[PDB]
Amino acid sequence: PKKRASNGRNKKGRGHVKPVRCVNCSRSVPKDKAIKRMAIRNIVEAAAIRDLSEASVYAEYALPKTYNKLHYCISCAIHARIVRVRSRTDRRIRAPPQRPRF
């Protein structure tokens, strides 16, 4: 039975797509069906900014952020809670989960 209309892959008109490797289990998966997450974080946590700020020669220096895109395999992500099973009627809600920070 057709689980999804878009086949849960999102190509529809390219025949084939270059595959990219998972960051957790190193699985090769097509880039479209690769459930990607941009992890923008600081080099230090919120519990360390104080010590670095008081141990800094520059008074107004703002610590820079680390950027990287994460390409998961699907199984690791279902395991690592970043992607969640849904009820059948709620599968089709394409919009990203509504921001809790309202």
């Binding site: 107004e60 220096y61 820079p64 952020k65 680390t66 950027y67 990287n68």
Partner: protein
């Protein structure tokens, strides 16, 4: 700790003694085109007859933040690599080697729903410095757009990059190292690129990255002293 087999391919006692007492410091000075000319202080093993300390010194590379040599914080993202070539004794003098962005600004400028433009050029300077210069641009959302994306057609990219090539070649082939750096520090090349490319496509975050040196001619001491003090 000590998760070791000690399979060494043997003396009863090894005299590590003091490694730092046989070491001396040396102050680094930047080319005059940078404002805060004093750089820092590097350590090195003391002189011996067979091997000159200055020999080991000439050839060193030092990374500095441009804001440290400017004083302003409008240049915290840039990264200047200088080259140790001549030493005056307890003080060493350096020549320009290269430029870069800290990775943070680089990944910051690369956002989604906008196509970046990467251009490269290889070019000889006025005197002999064979350089390679990169150029990054980002297509800008108009101040009126409802179009979520701001993608540019490949023809626009190609004309833009041809213009970039012309501008960079014109700027480099004319001027020397000192003039080139004095141009880069206010990044007026950025303004010139923006002005030229405003006719073809609206452009944003244009910068000049990774000023990479390929070849340098035979060293001239008088020129180095000219760049200093």
């Amino acid at each position: 700790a000590v998760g070791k087999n000690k399979r060494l391919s043997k003396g009863l006692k090894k005299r590590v003694v003091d490694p730092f007492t046989r070491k001396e410091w040396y102050d680094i000075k930047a080319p005059s085109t940078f404002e805060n000319r004093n750089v820092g202080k590097t350590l090195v093993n003391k002189s011996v007859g067979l091997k000159n300390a200055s020999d080991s010194l000439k050839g060193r590379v030092v990374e500095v933040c441009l804001a440290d040599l400017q004083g302003s914080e409008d240049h915290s993202f840039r990264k200047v690599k200088l080259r140790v070539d001549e030493v005056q004794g307890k003080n060493l003098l350096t020549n320009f080697h290269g430029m870069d962005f800290t990775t943070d600004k680089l990944r910051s400028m690369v956002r989604k729903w906008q196509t970046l433009i990467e251009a490269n050029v290889t070019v000889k300077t006025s005197d002999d410095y064979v350089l390679r210069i990169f150029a990054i641009a980002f297509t800008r959302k108009q101040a009126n757009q409802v179009k979520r994306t701001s993608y540019a057609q490949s023809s626009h990219i190609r004309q833009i990059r041809k213009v970039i090539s012309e501008i960079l070649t014109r700027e480099v082939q004319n001027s020397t190292l000192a003039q080139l750096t004095s141009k880069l520090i206010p990044e007026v090349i950025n303004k010139e690129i923006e002005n030229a490319t405003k006719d073809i496509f609206p452009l944003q975050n244009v910068h000049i990255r990774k000023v990479k040196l390929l070849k340098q001619p035979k060293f001239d001491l008088g020129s180095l002293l000219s760049l200093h003090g």
